[PDB]
Design a protein around this ligand. Structure first.
Ligand SMILES: OC[C@H]1O[C@H](O[C@H]2[C@H](O)[C@@H](O)[C@@H](O)O[C@@H]2CO)[C@H](O)[C@@H](O)[C@@H]1O
Ligand SMILES: OC[C@H]1O[C@H](O[C@H]2[C@H](O)[C@@H](O)[C@@H](O)O[C@@H]2CO)[C@H](O)[C@@H](O)[C@@H]1O
Length: 493
């Protein structure tokens, strides 16, 4: 049982509290965090995840980085016997679910935004979302001579060099490369800041002047210079059948609508690819893996228009796989797909949301495995209950434990949202400890990940670029891998 069981081990990470380093670049409560981290260590947790906030670190001005508070944080994590998942967080904290602290992007960038409002994702009404720089400015040299991708590149390089000792020592297991709002490769199509409420369809975020011009040039090249961006897609809180765009036989299935949706979703593929190229250059030779985050847009998954996925930039339909192209893009970077809505069951969602989180998880994970990449995940919402943990464990090993060897299917890791005093209360923490144990296939905590075939080797160069047509060959629908109806390693087991 034991070593066969150890090859079934799926590591568990815990997100740190938001604002552990505050907006003033102060590590405010090391002593309190220490006590919490030592509890996690004794509970068997493998490591922790933290946002390395751009708006904290590069606040003073371009290339004026202050890494000192984060060095103190990393030092503490190391002392407490935990590894670290470091998010390169190029986004704002404050306007998404659960955000309890306010960390804008650097003021010097916002200053440029006051003169050029088109550096922000923009909806049809003209509202500027300041949480992330539009993909439109990725390669526009408008930030005191740098492009947005150069900013991100320079930041990652500075992190790699200034944290070189922690990297060499093996503290950092993965670099989560932030690619949009909430760190995710997506558009801000469901902004609470503009009055969105679940389960609204959301809105397309491509009306900044850079994206609009790019679209207009592309439709002209396609022989349709008169095509305009969608004007019949409704508003954030609509339902799909209320809109010309998403109704049955609506604009989304027309040649115009299909072209738009392809263009819009391709912008994210290319944004992720180009930024991961820079991440690979920055961390070349380091014993880390790269990861990206994919949001779980489960509402409207069960209707043919998938409207909320579409407005988020995931062009996923019943007959078009919008996620497997992302997995294929990751393959050349040897990168992890971290899918950030892992814990849900369909029965938890209201019927009117047409919500399919179980099936969405199965689709995304299956696509990653079909494309021979590693797949990780997170719970979306705070959960302390056995139903949630058993669903996570199911997704972690969807065909169960292999008593005879490694499992044919397993996730590469799960990161739990989030460390809080509530997690550490007696009953909640007791159930969490059982979750960890079952994720670990009933084995004790295993400090050396080589033992469970998660050795960390130096980051190699990315493989050659994959052209967009080859990436989009992965839109071909495929059957998912079969899932058990329940895990064989329940917490109450
Ligand atoms: O980008 C943030 C977060 O958005 C989604 O979370 C949803 C959640 O699934 C809904 O049930 C509801 O609570 O609204 C949340 C958004 O405010 C994604 O599911 C998640 O993956 C992503 O991190
Ligand atoms: O600290 C990580 C990340 O947390 C929040 O975003 C979450 C979202 O709340 C979830 O639903 C989840 O599992 O995925 C997102 C990505 O981890 C903050 O909103 C975000 O700013 C922060 O980076």
């Amino acid at each position: 049982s034991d070593s066969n069981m150890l090859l079934n081990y799926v590591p568990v990470y815990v997100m740190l509290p938001l604002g552990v380093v505050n907006v003033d670049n102060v590590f405010e409560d090391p002593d309190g965090l220490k006590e919490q981290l030592l509890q996690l260590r004794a509970a068997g947790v493998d490591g922790v995840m933290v946002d390395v906030w751009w708006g904290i670190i590069e606040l003073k001005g371009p290339k004026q980085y202050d890494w000192r508070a984060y060095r103190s944080l990393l030092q503490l994590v190391q002392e407490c016997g935990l590894t670290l998942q470091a998010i390169m967080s190029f986004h704002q904290c404050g306007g998404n679910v659960g955000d309890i602290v306010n960390i804008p992007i650097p003021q010097w960038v916002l200053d440029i935004g006051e003169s050029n409002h088109d550096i922000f994702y923009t909806n049809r009404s003209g509202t500027r979302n300041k949480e992330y720089l539009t993909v439109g400015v990725d390669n526009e040299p408008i930030f005191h001579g740098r492009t947005a991708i150069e900013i991100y590149s320079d930041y990652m390089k500075s992190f790699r060099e200034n944290m070189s000792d922690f990297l060499e020592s093996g503290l950092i297991i993965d670099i989560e490369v932030g690619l949009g709002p909430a760190g995710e490769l997506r558009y801000p199509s469901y902004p609470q800041s503009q009055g969105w409420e679940f389960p609204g369809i959301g809105e397309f975020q491509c009306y900044d002047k850079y994206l609009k011009a790019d679209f207009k040039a592309a439709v002209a090249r396609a022989g349709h210079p008169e095509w305009e961006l969608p004007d019949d897609a409704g508003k954030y809180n609509d339902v799909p059948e209320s809109t010309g765009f998403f109704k049955s036989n609506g604009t989304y299935v027309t040649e115009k609508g299909k072209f738009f949706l392809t263009w819009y979703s391709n912008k994210l593929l290319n944004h992720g690819d180009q930024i991961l190229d820079e991440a690979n250059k920055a961390f070349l030779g380091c014993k880390v893996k790269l990861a990206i985050k994919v949001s779980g847009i489960h509402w409207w998954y069960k209707v043919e228009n998938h409207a909320a996925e579409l407005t988020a930039g995931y062009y996923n339909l019943n007959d078009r796989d919008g996620y497997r192209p992302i997995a294929r893009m990751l393959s050349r970077h040897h990168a992890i797909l971290n899918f950030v809505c892992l814990e849900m069951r369909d029965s938890e969602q209201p019927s009117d949301a047409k919500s399919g989180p179980q099936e969405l998880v199965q689709q995304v994970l299956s696509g990653g495995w079909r494309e021979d990449i590693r797949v990780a995940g997170e719970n979306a919402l705070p959960r302390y209950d056995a139903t949630a943990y058993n669903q996570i464990i199911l997704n972690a090993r969807p065909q169960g434990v292999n008593n005879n060897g490694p499992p044919k299917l397993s996730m590469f890791g799960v990161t739990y949202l989030r460390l809080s005093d509530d997690l550490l209360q007696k009953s909640n923490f007791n159930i969490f400890k059982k979750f960890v144990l079952k994720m670990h296939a009933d084995q004790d905590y295993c400090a050396n990940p080589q033992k469970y075939n998660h050795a960390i080797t130096p980051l190699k160069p990315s493989a050659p670029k994959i052209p967009i047509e080859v990436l989009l060959e992965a839109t071909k629908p495929t059957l998912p891998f079969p899932w058990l109806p329940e895990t064989d390693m329940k917490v109450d087991g």
